[model samples]
Target chain A: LNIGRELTDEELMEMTGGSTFSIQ
Target chain B: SNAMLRRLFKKKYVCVRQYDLTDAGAACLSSIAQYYGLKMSLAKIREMTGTDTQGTNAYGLIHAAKQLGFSAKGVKASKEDLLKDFRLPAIANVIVDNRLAHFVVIYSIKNRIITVADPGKGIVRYSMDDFCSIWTGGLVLLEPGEAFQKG
Candidate 1:
């Protein structure tokens, strides 16, 4: 049985680490 | 938060959300496949994304979708963009309680409200503010690509 877990902060940060654009 | 009953009231199918038992952590991958009415299976997605118990990385899924015939890309979006700009049925990677990196389908956003199909928690809604608080500002947007008949 292959169960899934929530993504680690490290994984999430690795993707969204750079602030490329403005939120507004 | 007010999106559930409201979505029901509107009675429109912006997108169909599904959960596949075999997909597991790759549900986000399969969710995009299902939403697009593609014949892709969880196994195929896993093969492409290197998905496992630890989960699929955003880049893997993004690239996989490209090969799967969609123009899938990662974008940083604000809650306001969700209401007025970003495409629908996006895969959102959000930090839950400021820790867990969970992926959910943001299929619809109406004004200040947003709706998601949480693979684990079922259908749920949150205010734009609540969503932004946890979101990592990351989204995977998918749409038709140059392959008019490819999958």
Candidate 2:
């Protein structure tokens, strides 16, 4: 249910640190 | 009928966003709100909860959710097993460091293995016994309304 602005692959990695959280 | 009563018309998993803040435990509310598609930038909740680097009284959360037209409630959990009775994606008022009050989102539960969308920690999991020991016996349930849609 992603509603926010799209992030680039680099940006995604920056925020999530390359680990997918169970909540997400 | 139960779903109708709850107004929990949809469910979705959202990526938890981490923020370092002490704004009256609104961090917990932020995670759950984002999950339910009510990402408010801490505006409605912050304003409604009267949060400004301060703590929120328990009902402020339910009131804030009601303000957003969601079916919300704050209920008691007497024991760890009582957590099974709670609604999913709920907000739990917990004590961290064994003394300070912090609210966290109860993201998932697998028997004794429970997951939390914590404010300080991005995503964390703990056993039931370990989790409830830090809880304040209260949790807030927020559900979308009948016509509300999620991404």
Candidate 3:
């Protein structure tokens, strides 16, 4: 999906690489 | 040193945590919600799950999926099956020592490597064999995006 944002290929890789942010 | 870089990392780290499948699963859903322009809070997700008690996290996926107007199905497949025509953003129920179950998101699959969004350990990638070793043959796939908009 487009994720409702303009994410570059690099940014997409970085976001999906290994990041966690949970208010859990 | 870049203060902005530091803040960006801090922001992402603070947004992730580890707990039960319920919390972790809901966290994944919340991220999806954000993509749809619905900023969700942890409490809101907990509300969606219908309970915040320990040992009840397993039910979170049911309610969370319901809230998002998505369909969930229990699936069984081999590593080859998953690797071939694998779906993105799959929620996997992994068995720990054949006793406890933990949830992780299969956010990406590229070149036979599955990149997971693990709440406890950030991002981790594994070959099909390694991933299935702990996968327990269970997965929950959110319905298509159009299904979500119908909610």
Candidate 4:
């Protein structure tokens, strides 16, 4: 339950570890 | 000074996000979220970023370490160490897991279309740019062929 949001950038960042030129 | 040089670290980070989904990423995410009893109210992707998700960042390193053969030792492991210690078994693991995983990630980046295993139960889809933005932490950017001398 600590992690929420339909789609969060942090989860994506942590998982993928890509650049941040694009964001939510 | 030659004795103390400042070297820039560069990275070509890759990950297998959502793949092989019957639904597009945004729609699939919404559907799955709803299934999980979560809220989903957006004509489009109202919000989605790596920062919003947790534990997703570290999985890539772990997955990479496993696939690249670094004794499952992640970012800290040198490429050479990975090659020496784990590459073969990692490849083998993929081969064995492929049957069970039963999905694939296909995309074109940097003029190359890569097909990788979709090991998870679900698949999500998004533009390459969207994928890039969310997972920005632990990310090191570099130009192609750029060299870095660092400890």
TM-score of each: 0.68, 0.66, 0.61, 0.20
lDDT-based ranking: 1, 2, 3, 4
- lDDT, residue B19, candidate 2: 45
**In model 4 chain B, where is the ten-residue run with the lowest total lDDT?**
B88-97
lDDT digits (tens) for residues B14-36 of candidate 3:
35444555466566655545434
Give lDDT per model, in order: 0.60, 0.57, 0.53, 0.26
Question: Mind listing the fnat for each candidate?
Answer: 0.03, 0.00, 0.00, 0.11
Order the candidates by TM-score, highest first — what do you get?
1, 2, 3, 4
**Model 4 in CAPRI terms: which quality?**
incorrect
All candidates: DockQ: 0.06, 0.02, 0.03, 0.07
Q: lDDT per residue, candidate 2, B1-151, as tens digits?
A: 5554444457665554444355435656666777656766544466775553444555555666677776666554555544455446767767654446666777667777778777667678888778877664566656656456532
lDDT of 4 at B5: 56
Per-residue lDDT for B53 in model 1? 41
- Model 1, position B49, has a per-residue lDDT of 66
Model number with the top DockQ? 4
Per-residue CA lDDT of model 2 for A1-24, tens digit only, reads: 111233233321221111122333
Model 3 misplaced regions, further than 4 Å: A1-24, B1-14, B17-22, B51-53, B56-60, B147-151
Q: Tell me, by TM-score, which candidate is best.
A: 1
Kindly give the stretch of ten consecutive residues in candidate 3 chain B with the minimal lDDT sum: B5-14
Q: For residues B24-105, what per-residue lDDT tens digits would candidate 1 score against the true structure?
A: 3356666656655566765667677665444445766666777766666666666667757544676777666554566777
The TM-score that candidate 4 achieves is 0.20
lDDT of 1 at B132: 81
